[PDB]
């Protein structure tokens, strides 16, 4: 009821600390496929048996583990996803979103709401993407974190959008190529380009080779504020526009408009907020995403009306917004050049 | 499913920061019974309209508010409970559990699991109850926080335990008298004593007078390690034993045994953990409670077997464990003197 829901919201930070400890101590990999004894696990992570037991009991209480017998633990399907080696692993995602880099800025949430600018810069001394460009191990974690987040979209997009009419697709800020890989895997004759920062482009180039898509997926690097590489039939921009304030978004959509020319189409893959906020079945709460974008980057999530205006301004019209399955929490906004 | 549950656990800390901001900014009292315009609310808390709007949208997304029209907000039943003036208010509870005093120690959870002792002492420079004895405004908040938590138990205990056979009941560590008040309100001829620290006894004395129970409820102060006042038919100890390590608990139960003498009974009102950890329908997760007791006090939650042993040792036998409604998450453990 009403009181239980409030209690659940209030104790979220303590729940996150329990999950953060599981992730940092690599307990999911320690347990793996079997039933593990707390005493055996205790010698794997430099915690005493009693302390590790209480942590594992909380993880069982939170649906991440099962205590089959006293002191004997197996993973649930949820806990299995924190294994580094799970085929659907979100281990790096879990580490990224529990790192000081992504959590310390939330300690100043009110300042971010007051100033309208990110608190990340205050805590770490530069904007997030500049900071990561100078911290290769955080950059590495971020690339893997966005892969983990994008799995839900990558696994569903090609079943909710017809890619068959296109010869070429360019993913603008396409990360390590998780999204474009999933699309190319379903369309053998389709050709791809990932457009990224030089740093992330290095990760994407290796991913494309590792995935055996080198022959029909290229990687190009640059600055989507400077330009987007031209000549493609379809442009994707996923989980990118929400990183930026309204003016920076127009500048990105402006680079996209030039690339579209006559016969180009843009697919904006992002949260489309309703005009009136309400509870959402998305795996990741879109209003928490909105405030994450504020504190980390000075970005935000947007309604169809807020984006339709930013398109209008870039010389683009929102043609059509297509849904994904409710658990994904992103929509496909088709954008074409404005008739003007 | 599995992935959505993991995502929910990981983003708990950001959800808590949103609720903490609602509580600190007194937004529940600002909105109150009506529909409030974001622009009118913005001039109540020194946030700009846009920033406050995004916070309120997240609160609507988390079930604390309703956006009836764009920029127009009402409380839900859950949000209503954060009003200072709500008859079932947990406002002080919300402020206490989002204060640095109760959250900073969680930043060192692993150290607490490693050392088995509280991280509060390291952060704030003394044990929690000593610290609060020296910080009257935190002591005040704590008294009101425990009242808010105890409402669920106070509203249910007398319907799940027969108090009619007793002439006198003494609440050992009875806080501001929330629990004993609820019992006395249902038993007009029953007499009560609250046994507390001098500091909290001041709060209980005022509460008993305010509630019109002065004529049949007394307040006495001292140290339950020194003694528990004798001569009562029934002793209550609620949310107290979980504050202490096993040896301190035996010392408290030892004071209780002396007070029971021949015809005295003890009711231990606390979490009774199962031997094997699993998800729990309690409004407050008992394993998160366990780790809260570790980081703040070096306490813990206990199984019936763990408590039955600590009783045996105090010269007491666990007679019988009685359930409360599943949402409460506390049980009534009847304890009588050990036959020996
Ligand atoms: N100026 C710029 N030019 C090009 N790419 C940029 C950029 N600034 C940031 N980026 C890239 O924008 C991406 C946003 S994260 C989204 C990654 C991917 N589309 C996914 O959904 O998983 C990052 O990978 C970052 O490297
Ligand atoms: N040495 C001591 N002697 C007596 N009371 C003590 C004590 N140390 C702590 N306490 C009291 O123990 C209480 C534990 S909190 C529980 C309060 C109440 N039973 C409720 O459930 O709401 C506090 O109110 C604190 O003041
Ligand atoms: C319930 C909240 C979920 C938040 C998910 C989130 O923040 N995703 C995210 C982040 S964090 S730093 C950069 C990014 N980008 C590009 C993202 O898409
Ligand atoms: C999901 C976690 C809920 C935690 C509830 C909690 O911690 N209660 C608490 C605290 S905090 S400081 C002293 C105390 N006492 C006596 C308590 O009973």
XYZ file of C-alpha atoms and ligand atoms in Angstrom:
768
model
C 0.000 0.000 0.000
C 0.836 3.738 0.378
C 3.192 3.363 3.412
C 5.039 0.262 1.990
C 5.690 2.110 -1.334
C 7.155 5.139 0.574
C 9.331 2.796 2.755
C 10.591 1.054 -0.461
C 11.605 4.473 -1.997
C 13.351 5.692 1.234
C 15.622 2.575 1.663
C 16.743 2.444 -2.025
C 20.233 3.920 -1.225
C 20.976 1.066 1.272
C 19.747 -1.548 -1.292
C 22.147 0.044 -3.886
C 25.095 -0.194 -1.380
C 24.366 -3.981 -0.949
C 24.371 -4.476 -4.785
C 27.503 -2.237 -5.133
C 29.297 -4.521 -2.569
C 28.223 -7.695 -4.492
C 29.610 -6.124 -7.753
C 32.903 -4.759 -6.241
C 33.631 -8.111 -4.424
C 32.889 -10.105 -7.675
C 30.617 -12.441 -5.592
C 28.521 -13.380 -8.716
C 31.654 -14.816 -10.467
C 32.762 -16.488 -7.153
C 29.360 -18.326 -6.849
C 28.967 -18.831 -10.663
C 26.780 -21.810 -11.761
C 26.978 -23.832 -8.488
C 25.998 -23.758 -4.791
C 28.912 -22.080 -2.888
C 29.632 -22.370 0.892
C 29.953 -18.953 2.686
C 33.274 -20.185 4.289
C 34.752 -20.984 0.789
C 33.484 -17.579 -0.573
C 34.992 -15.803 2.538
C 38.570 -16.819 1.432
C 37.847 -15.394 -2.119
C 37.214 -11.696 -1.119
C 39.008 -10.991 2.265
C 35.706 -10.800 4.278
C 35.144 -12.972 7.398
C 32.451 -15.741 7.135
C 29.890 -13.939 9.421
C 30.163 -10.558 7.566
C 29.996 -12.181 4.082
C 27.046 -14.362 5.326
C 24.997 -11.250 6.383
C 25.744 -9.559 2.979
C 24.672 -12.755 1.078
C 21.491 -12.988 3.256
C 20.598 -9.353 2.258
C 21.309 -10.271 -1.426
C 18.945 -13.312 -1.028
C 16.381 -10.947 0.609
C 16.718 -8.671 -2.483
C 16.300 -11.568 -5.009
C 19.971 -11.669 -6.235
C 20.904 -15.022 -4.508
C 19.162 -18.125 -2.993
C 20.127 -19.583 0.436
C 19.303 -23.261 -0.446
C 20.686 -24.412 2.978
C 22.109 -22.245 5.832
C 25.465 -20.822 4.561
C 24.994 -22.303 1.016
C 24.225 -19.805 -1.824
C 23.318 -19.991 -5.551
C 22.651 -17.015 -7.902
C 19.131 -16.168 -9.148
C 18.704 -15.153 -12.848
C 19.118 -11.513 -11.570
C 22.418 -12.301 -9.729
C 23.665 -14.242 -12.818
C 23.585 -10.903 -14.805
C 26.344 -9.493 -12.470
C 28.760 -12.269 -13.627
C 31.479 -10.680 -15.878
C 31.175 -13.798 -18.142
C 27.310 -13.901 -18.466
C 26.202 -13.595 -22.147
C 23.687 -10.846 -21.040
C 26.144 -9.406 -18.403
C 25.463 -5.882 -17.004
C 28.481 -6.216 -14.622
C 30.252 -3.116 -16.112
C 26.882 -1.220 -16.105
C 26.519 -2.091 -12.356
C 30.134 -0.943 -11.577
C 29.727 2.295 -13.665
C 26.410 3.357 -11.993
C 27.822 2.608 -8.450
C 31.218 4.360 -9.128
C 31.874 7.681 -7.296
C 31.931 9.336 -10.796
C 28.148 8.698 -11.326
C 26.929 8.801 -7.638
C 28.894 11.691 -5.943
C 27.145 14.271 -8.232
C 23.727 13.061 -6.818
C 24.853 14.253 -3.296
C 24.402 17.830 -4.753
C 21.080 17.102 -6.606
C 19.420 20.314 -5.225
C 22.363 22.504 -6.473
C 21.923 20.908 -9.973
C 18.133 21.682 -9.801
C 18.991 25.281 -8.623
C 21.820 26.009 -11.187
C 20.430 23.797 -14.039
C 24.068 22.687 -14.751
C 25.904 19.424 -13.867
C 27.495 18.882 -10.389
C 29.935 16.320 -11.951
C 32.186 19.224 -13.173
C 32.348 20.666 -9.573
C 33.345 17.245 -8.044
C 35.816 15.932 -10.724
C 37.086 19.216 -12.305
C 35.907 18.925 -15.984
C 32.831 17.918 -18.081
C 32.163 14.118 -17.995
C 33.179 13.253 -21.635
C 36.383 15.394 -21.354
C 37.148 13.695 -17.955
C 36.614 10.174 -19.461
C 38.799 11.086 -22.531
C 41.591 11.654 -19.906
C 40.693 8.486 -17.841
C 40.970 5.475 -20.234
C 39.865 2.845 -17.607
C 36.635 4.862 -16.880
C 36.186 5.310 -20.704
C 36.552 1.467 -21.029
C 33.964 0.896 -18.216
C 31.566 3.474 -19.822
C 31.738 1.733 -23.273
C 30.834 -1.629 -21.585
C 28.190 0.079 -19.332
C 26.352 1.522 -22.404
C 26.581 -1.941 -24.129
C 24.858 -3.477 -21.036
C 22.132 -0.782 -21.001
C 21.582 -0.996 -24.813
C 21.000 -4.837 -24.863
C 17.223 -4.295 -24.229
C 17.003 -1.914 -27.273
C 19.433 -3.960 -29.485
C 17.366 -7.169 -28.883
C 14.005 -5.467 -29.843
C 14.647 -2.579 -32.363
C 14.812 -4.687 -35.622
C 11.497 -6.444 -34.662
C 9.751 -3.000 -34.221
C 11.407 -1.094 -37.165
C 11.795 -2.319 -40.806
C 15.524 -1.879 -41.755
C 14.996 -3.780 -45.103
C 14.459 -0.570 -47.228
C 18.019 0.774 -46.438
C 21.397 -0.049 -48.099
C 23.477 1.890 -45.481
C 22.924 2.852 -41.781
C 25.196 5.227 -39.748
C 24.998 5.106 -35.909
C 25.771 8.682 -34.637
C 27.477 8.226 -31.217
C 27.046 4.436 -31.740
C 29.332 3.487 -28.779
C 31.134 0.100 -29.171
C 28.691 -0.924 -31.991
C 26.267 -2.980 -29.773
C 23.193 -1.446 -31.534
C 24.452 -1.568 -35.180
C 25.845 -5.158 -34.687
C 22.335 -6.385 -33.633
C 20.796 -4.698 -36.761
C 23.516 -6.010 -39.184
C 23.178 -9.579 -37.690
C 19.527 -9.587 -39.007
C 20.261 -7.931 -42.444
C 23.223 -9.707 -44.154
C 23.430 -7.296 -47.189
C 23.020 -4.108 -45.017
C 26.176 -1.910 -44.612
C 26.950 -0.001 -41.375
C 29.086 2.906 -40.116
C 29.730 3.735 -36.408
C 30.495 7.476 -35.880
C 32.201 8.049 -32.480
C 34.917 9.994 -30.591
C 38.460 8.774 -31.474
C 38.699 7.073 -27.999
C 35.384 5.083 -28.272
C 35.949 4.494 -32.060
C 39.027 2.380 -31.023
C 36.640 0.128 -28.958
C 34.043 -0.039 -31.831
C 36.759 -0.953 -34.447
C 37.901 -3.908 -32.244
C 34.238 -4.959 -31.543
C 33.326 -4.959 -35.295
C 36.434 -7.127 -36.084
C 35.729 -9.470 -33.087
C 32.041 -9.815 -34.240
C 33.122 -10.662 -37.869
C 31.382 -7.561 -39.364
C 34.639 -5.806 -40.577
C 33.591 -6.563 -44.235
C 30.354 -4.436 -44.023
C 30.706 -2.206 -40.883
C 33.188 0.722 -40.841
C 34.196 3.002 -37.920
C 34.817 6.777 -38.420
C 35.718 9.290 -35.644
C 35.083 13.016 -35.178
C 32.711 15.497 -33.508
C 28.913 15.428 -34.265
C 29.000 19.230 -33.445
C 31.412 19.601 -36.445
C 29.610 17.108 -38.799
C 27.991 13.644 -39.276
C 29.512 11.617 -42.185
C 27.171 11.918 -45.233
C 25.878 9.479 -47.874
C 23.901 6.999 -45.663
C 20.164 6.141 -46.226
C 19.431 5.943 -42.432
C 21.046 7.696 -39.395
C 20.579 6.370 -35.809
C 21.158 8.537 -32.691
C 20.554 6.491 -29.482
C 20.883 7.640 -25.807
C 22.872 10.676 -27.141
C 20.493 13.718 -27.421
C 19.452 13.278 -23.702
C 23.182 13.933 -22.789
C 22.964 17.598 -24.011
C 21.076 20.880 -23.247
C 18.573 22.151 -25.913
C 21.085 24.340 -27.892
C 23.778 21.557 -28.096
C 20.960 19.152 -29.266
C 19.962 21.614 -32.101
C 23.716 21.759 -33.095
C 23.792 17.884 -33.232
C 20.452 17.737 -35.177
C 21.919 20.498 -37.489
C 24.919 18.194 -38.334
C 22.336 15.366 -38.891
C 20.147 17.527 -41.243
C 23.205 18.271 -43.503
C 23.985 14.474 -43.589
C 20.309 13.589 -44.484
C 20.378 15.930 -47.570
C 17.406 14.781 -49.806
C 16.802 11.007 -49.204
C 18.257 10.627 -45.636
C 16.103 9.648 -42.587
C 17.064 10.076 -38.862
C 15.933 7.653 -36.079
C 16.173 9.344 -32.626
C 16.263 6.393 -30.144
C 15.580 7.898 -26.671
C 12.966 8.326 -23.887
C 9.864 10.225 -25.124
C 8.376 11.562 -21.814
C 4.587 12.054 -21.559
C 3.311 15.679 -21.109
C 2.106 14.547 -17.600
C 4.564 12.471 -15.463
C 3.278 9.103 -14.082
C 4.718 5.683 -13.036
C 6.404 3.823 -15.959
C 7.002 0.060 -16.549
C 10.458 0.763 -18.173
C 13.342 -1.291 -16.606
C 15.062 2.120 -15.981
C 12.872 4.972 -14.588
C 12.892 7.757 -17.242
C 12.585 10.634 -14.645
C 15.566 9.213 -12.653
C 17.308 9.147 -16.126
C 16.286 12.840 -16.579
C 17.915 13.813 -13.217
C 20.991 11.578 -13.971
C 21.430 13.543 -17.267
C 21.095 16.833 -15.241
C 23.694 16.032 -12.481
C 26.263 14.273 -14.805
C 26.012 16.276 -18.102
C 23.392 19.099 -17.793
C 21.230 17.059 -20.223
C 17.553 15.999 -19.851
C 14.790 13.659 -21.132
C 12.158 15.342 -23.370
C 8.464 15.040 -24.397
C 7.520 14.575 -28.118
C 6.503 18.318 -28.111
C 9.917 19.444 -26.633
C 11.817 17.319 -29.259
C 9.386 18.249 -32.161
C 10.347 21.931 -31.476
C 14.143 21.165 -31.335
C 13.728 19.319 -34.720
C 11.652 22.174 -36.272
C 14.632 24.430 -35.238
C 17.336 22.097 -36.751
C 15.350 22.307 -40.065
C 13.800 18.859 -39.268
C 10.192 17.628 -38.601
C 9.344 14.742 -36.204
C 7.531 12.491 -38.759
C 6.380 9.690 -36.422
C 7.160 8.154 -32.947
C 7.134 4.281 -32.831
C 6.990 2.323 -29.520
C 9.312 -0.459 -28.242
C 8.123 -3.085 -25.697
C 7.204 -1.255 -22.433
C 10.175 -2.724 -20.406
C 12.732 -1.055 -22.814
C 11.605 2.545 -22.007
C 12.926 4.063 -25.289
C 10.879 5.061 -28.407
C 11.909 5.355 -32.117
C 11.314 8.986 -33.302
C 11.515 9.140 -37.154
C 12.869 12.601 -38.234
C 12.970 13.867 -41.901
C 14.079 17.288 -43.300
C 11.489 20.099 -42.678
C 9.586 21.146 -45.857
C 10.352 24.857 -45.003
C 11.731 -10.126 -14.934
C 15.348 -10.867 -13.846
C 16.966 -7.817 -15.572
C 14.212 -5.327 -14.449
C 14.586 -6.485 -10.787
C 18.413 -5.951 -10.953
C 17.924 -2.473 -12.579
C 15.421 -1.569 -9.773
C 18.006 -2.565 -7.052
C 20.909 -0.654 -8.753
C 19.040 2.733 -9.049
C 17.688 2.709 -5.437
C 20.278 5.325 -4.236
C 19.079 7.872 -6.883
C 15.399 7.182 -5.936
C 16.352 7.847 -2.238
C 18.032 11.199 -3.220
C 14.744 12.283 -4.973
C 12.701 11.407 -1.808
C 15.364 13.069 0.447
C 14.980 16.301 -1.653
C 11.131 16.162 -1.350
C 11.500 15.773 2.489
C 14.240 18.468 2.962
C 12.321 21.018 0.753
C 9.022 20.293 2.674
C 7.248 19.905 -0.740
C 4.532 17.605 0.800
C 3.436 20.413 3.222
C 3.704 23.010 0.360
C 1.291 20.934 -1.858
C -0.863 19.725 1.118
C -4.508 18.778 0.297
C -4.817 20.727 -3.013
C -3.469 20.899 -6.588
C -0.402 23.248 -6.523
C 1.144 25.063 -9.557
C 4.937 24.414 -9.998
C 5.483 28.250 -10.328
C 3.734 28.866 -6.917
C 5.739 25.957 -5.312
C 9.006 27.395 -6.852
C 8.668 30.592 -4.679
C 8.197 28.364 -1.521
C 11.629 26.549 -1.600
C 14.168 28.761 -3.558
C 14.253 26.405 -6.630
C 13.538 27.717 -10.170
C 10.284 26.483 -11.865
C 12.081 24.167 -14.402
C 14.291 22.458 -11.729
C 11.376 22.006 -9.260
C 9.191 20.731 -12.194
C 11.745 17.958 -13.085
C 11.977 16.927 -9.359
C 8.119 16.804 -9.080
C 7.942 14.777 -12.363
C 10.405 12.199 -10.848
C 8.261 12.152 -7.636
C 5.142 11.502 -9.840
C 7.151 8.764 -11.659
C 7.905 7.222 -8.207
C 4.224 7.360 -7.030
C 4.652 10.220 -4.455
C 2.752 12.921 -6.501
C 0.225 13.152 -9.420
C 0.685 15.568 -12.381
C -3.090 16.151 -13.013
C -2.250 18.798 -15.705
C 1.221 19.926 -16.948
C 2.855 21.862 -14.035
C -0.049 21.071 -11.600
C 0.691 18.554 -8.770
C -1.295 16.793 -5.995
C 0.093 14.301 -3.407
C -0.691 10.557 -3.577
C -1.495 8.713 -0.283
C 2.298 7.905 -0.176
C 3.321 11.603 -0.594
C 0.695 12.617 2.041
C 2.715 10.582 4.666
C 5.690 13.032 4.219
C 3.488 15.952 5.446
C 4.672 16.991 8.982
C 0.944 17.395 9.919
C -0.367 14.013 8.539
C -1.966 11.885 11.329
C 0.164 8.877 10.095
C 3.208 11.140 9.268
C 6.644 9.471 8.776
C 8.208 12.888 7.903
C 10.750 12.692 10.813
C 11.442 8.992 9.924
C 12.169 10.109 6.295
C 14.503 12.965 7.473
C 16.299 10.663 10.019
C 16.988 7.832 7.482
C 18.233 10.369 4.813
C 20.411 12.369 7.326
C 24.232 12.061 6.968
C 24.199 10.422 10.475
C 22.363 7.278 9.155
C 23.665 7.231 5.495
C 27.422 8.193 5.684
C 28.191 4.953 7.649
C 26.783 2.914 4.648
C 29.612 4.384 2.427
C 31.955 2.081 4.507
C 29.613 -1.003 4.495
C 32.498 -3.391 3.518
C 34.686 -2.126 6.455
C 31.712 -2.829 8.831
C 31.387 -6.373 7.304
C 35.227 -6.809 7.673
C 35.568 -5.403 11.280
C 32.069 -6.482 12.523
C 31.834 -3.082 14.355
C 29.909 0.121 13.442
C 31.355 2.707 10.963
C 29.173 5.442 12.610
C 31.793 5.818 15.436
C 34.600 6.374 12.813
C 32.575 9.103 10.945
C 31.008 11.024 13.923
C 33.529 10.293 16.751
C 31.396 8.354 19.341
C 28.781 5.530 19.564
C 25.353 6.573 18.130
C 23.358 6.779 21.448
C 26.221 8.723 23.164
C 26.405 11.060 20.077
C 22.584 11.649 20.150
C 22.690 12.280 23.974
C 25.071 15.193 23.051
C 22.957 16.334 19.995
C 19.431 17.158 21.318
C 17.960 18.055 17.844
C 19.098 14.629 16.428
C 17.746 12.969 19.660
C 14.398 14.805 19.003
C 14.365 13.612 15.328
C 15.237 10.007 16.431
C 12.330 9.906 18.982
C 9.888 11.017 16.194
C 11.568 8.660 13.622
C 11.001 5.598 15.904
C 7.352 6.759 16.503
C 6.848 6.796 12.677
C 8.421 3.324 12.262
C 6.474 1.858 15.253
C 2.978 2.954 13.960
C 2.652 -0.350 11.976
C 3.360 -2.402 15.180
C 1.345 -0.076 17.530
C -1.748 -0.342 15.229
C -1.630 -4.226 15.122
C -0.022 -5.599 18.382
C -3.166 -5.497 20.660
C -5.207 -7.345 17.937
C -2.543 -10.171 17.798
C -1.676 -10.378 21.574
C -4.158 -10.563 24.525
C -3.131 -7.802 27.040
C -6.330 -8.410 29.161
C -4.609 -10.822 31.675
C -2.117 -8.093 32.877
C -2.578 -5.306 35.498
C 0.782 -3.584 34.670
C 3.016 -3.414 31.524
C 6.558 -1.876 31.405
C 8.018 -0.907 27.980
C 11.854 -1.380 28.226
C 13.382 1.253 25.870
C 9.772 2.324 25.063
C 10.845 5.534 23.207
C 8.266 8.397 23.343
C 5.508 5.921 24.452
C 3.989 5.323 20.936
C 3.705 1.529 21.593
C 2.417 1.631 25.229
C -0.079 4.478 24.373
C -1.679 2.266 21.637
C -1.975 -0.657 24.161
C -3.364 1.552 27.023
C -5.907 3.182 24.580
C -7.494 -0.336 24.173
C -7.308 -1.374 27.913
C -8.729 1.440 30.130
C -7.872 -0.254 33.516
C -4.322 -1.329 32.376
C -1.370 0.585 33.982
C 1.858 1.369 32.062
C 5.496 2.348 32.703
C 7.954 3.608 30.016
C 11.617 2.847 30.946
C 14.023 5.042 28.899
C 17.260 7.104 28.969
C 16.832 10.420 30.877
C 16.896 12.326 27.502
C 14.135 10.226 25.775
C 12.189 9.885 29.109
C 11.668 13.720 28.913
C 9.926 13.192 25.489
C 7.842 10.209 26.822
C 6.713 12.192 29.961
C 5.415 15.042 27.706
C 3.776 12.524 25.260
C 1.938 10.672 28.107
C 0.609 14.038 29.482
C -0.346 15.263 25.938
C -2.166 11.901 25.278
C -4.122 12.159 28.619
C -2.567 8.933 30.053
C -0.650 10.661 32.969
C -3.140 9.037 35.463
C -2.126 5.414 34.519
C 1.220 5.672 32.596
C 4.459 6.595 34.437
C 7.939 7.336 32.993
C 11.158 6.146 34.757
C 14.748 6.656 33.459
C 17.978 4.677 33.847
C 20.155 2.064 32.113
C 18.710 -1.396 31.144
C 22.357 -2.684 31.553
C 22.090 -1.611 35.259
C 18.442 -2.787 35.819
C 14.800 -2.864 34.565
C 12.253 -1.528 37.136
C 10.570 -4.537 38.860
C 6.991 -5.377 39.898
C 5.229 -5.414 36.456
C 3.202 -8.436 35.122
C 4.425 -7.908 31.489
C 7.671 -6.390 30.052
C 7.908 -5.218 26.390
C 11.253 -4.744 24.564
C 10.672 -3.496 20.965
C 13.305 -2.651 18.264
C 15.919 -2.589 21.114
C 17.755 -5.996 21.215
C 18.651 -5.654 17.448
C 20.648 -2.453 18.420
C 23.232 -4.526 20.421
C 25.853 -7.314 19.898
C 25.122 -10.762 21.500
C 26.881 -10.077 24.884
C 25.152 -6.645 25.405
C 21.793 -8.397 24.543
C 22.441 -11.096 27.262
C 23.202 -8.202 29.742
C 19.824 -6.549 28.793
C 17.939 -9.919 29.018
C 19.756 -10.468 32.411
C 18.257 -7.155 33.750
C 14.858 -8.353 32.338
C 15.115 -11.815 34.054
C 15.663 -10.132 37.501
C 12.572 -7.891 36.826
C 10.399 -10.942 35.796
C 11.135 -12.741 39.148
C 8.368 -15.455 39.494
C 5.198 -14.222 37.650
C 6.784 -11.795 35.083
C 6.619 -12.377 31.271
C 8.829 -10.670 28.589
C 7.595 -9.839 25.028
C 10.577 -9.362 22.635
C 9.104 -7.341 19.698
C 11.674 -7.577 16.846
C 12.481 -9.220 13.468
C 12.726 -13.043 13.764
C 14.856 -13.947 10.666
C 14.323 -17.348 8.988
C 17.281 -19.842 9.091
C 17.445 -19.410 5.240
C 17.247 -15.813 3.846
C 14.564 -15.116 1.159
C 12.460 -12.143 -0.104
C 10.098 -10.738 2.595
C 6.773 -8.811 2.288
C 7.665 -6.586 5.343
C 7.365 -2.794 4.627
C 11.053 -2.565 5.782
C 13.484 -5.255 4.468
C 14.772 -7.159 7.552
C 18.261 -7.894 6.002
C 18.713 -4.163 5.140
C 17.681 -3.619 8.847
C 20.387 -6.178 9.854
C 23.101 -4.228 7.922
C 21.720 -0.852 9.234
C 22.148 -2.233 12.815
C 25.745 -3.328 11.863
C 26.948 0.032 10.354
C 25.173 2.326 12.939
C 25.440 0.333 16.242
C 27.268 -3.022 15.672
C 23.877 -4.720 16.274
C 22.087 -7.339 14.103
C 18.754 -9.104 13.378
C 18.522 -12.714 14.673
C 16.791 -16.064 13.914
C 14.556 -17.738 16.590
C 17.500 -20.184 17.217
C 20.053 -17.293 17.702
C 17.648 -15.509 20.162
C 16.543 -18.819 21.901
C 20.277 -19.341 22.761
C 20.742 -15.707 24.022
C 17.607 -16.250 26.238
C 18.831 -19.678 27.510
C 22.049 -17.763 28.516
C 20.159 -14.882 30.296
C 18.386 -17.622 32.374
C 15.313 -17.285 30.055
C 13.519 -19.691 27.610
C 11.804 -18.531 24.370
C 8.276 -19.873 25.167
C 6.523 -19.028 21.874
C 6.882 -16.725 18.775
C 3.585 -15.089 17.564
C 3.252 -13.452 14.097
C 2.045 -9.919 13.185
C 0.520 -9.120 9.747
C 3.215 -9.754 7.067
C 3.638 -6.001 6.158
C 4.781 -5.180 9.783
C 7.907 -7.434 9.634
C 8.204 -7.863 13.449
C 7.175 -10.931 15.555
C 6.154 -11.220 19.268
C 8.618 -13.593 21.067
C 7.183 -14.577 24.513
C 10.092 -15.169 26.997
C 9.666 -16.653 30.557
C 12.338 -17.529 33.200
C 14.295 -20.766 32.370
C 13.323 -23.748 34.603
C 17.098 -24.403 35.243
N 31.311 15.357 -29.802
C 31.053 14.063 -29.958
N 31.135 13.520 -31.198
C 30.862 12.217 -31.346
N 30.490 11.326 -30.427
C 30.406 11.892 -29.210
C 30.666 13.214 -28.900
N 30.474 13.442 -27.545
C 30.107 12.277 -27.071
N 30.053 11.291 -28.024
C 29.664 9.898 -27.826
O 28.286 9.856 -27.555
C 28.001 8.559 -26.984
C 26.804 8.683 -26.071
S 26.440 7.173 -25.143
C 25.413 6.257 -26.319
C 26.151 5.085 -26.936
C 25.271 4.168 -27.789
N 24.473 4.949 -28.785
C 24.322 3.382 -26.875
O 23.139 3.689 -26.810
O 24.719 2.436 -26.191
C 29.298 8.104 -26.300
O 29.698 6.813 -26.753
C 30.311 9.212 -26.630
O 31.597 8.719 -26.934
N 21.203 1.968 28.291
C 19.950 2.244 27.949
N 18.982 2.191 28.898
C 17.719 2.460 28.541
N 17.234 2.774 27.340
C 18.212 2.810 26.417
C 19.555 2.567 26.635
N 20.269 2.690 25.451
C 19.361 2.997 24.558
N 18.094 3.094 25.075
C 16.867 3.400 24.346
O 16.558 2.306 23.520
C 15.600 2.766 22.540
C 15.756 1.941 21.284
S 14.743 2.525 19.903
C 13.169 1.690 20.223
C 12.106 2.643 20.733
C 10.708 2.027 20.836
N 10.738 0.728 21.579
C 10.149 1.798 19.426
O 10.110 0.667 18.959
O 9.733 2.732 18.736
C 15.861 4.270 22.368
O 14.669 5.028 22.561
C 16.962 4.584 23.394
O 16.770 5.814 24.058
C 17.289 4.890 -13.641
C 18.429 5.770 -14.166
C 19.107 5.127 -15.375
C 20.240 6.039 -15.853
C 20.847 5.525 -17.168
C 21.903 6.525 -17.677
O 22.239 7.480 -16.980
N 22.348 6.283 -18.932
C 23.308 7.027 -19.518
C 24.419 7.615 -19.010
S 25.218 7.885 -17.460
S 26.788 8.977 -18.256
C 26.256 8.901 -19.841
C 25.102 8.215 -20.054
N 24.392 7.952 -21.146
C 24.734 8.336 -22.496
C 23.332 7.242 -20.833
O 22.493 6.851 -21.648
C 15.054 -1.143 5.491
C 15.911 -0.679 6.674
C 15.038 -0.167 7.818
C 15.940 0.291 8.966
C 15.113 0.657 10.208
C 16.057 1.003 11.376
O 17.269 1.090 11.189
N 15.445 1.132 12.576
C 16.109 1.482 13.696
C 17.142 2.337 13.894
S 18.253 3.353 12.973
S 19.300 4.022 14.630
C 18.417 3.146 15.749
C 17.412 2.378 15.252
N 16.524 1.566 15.818
C 16.383 1.317 17.234
C 15.746 1.039 14.900
O 14.830 0.248 15.138
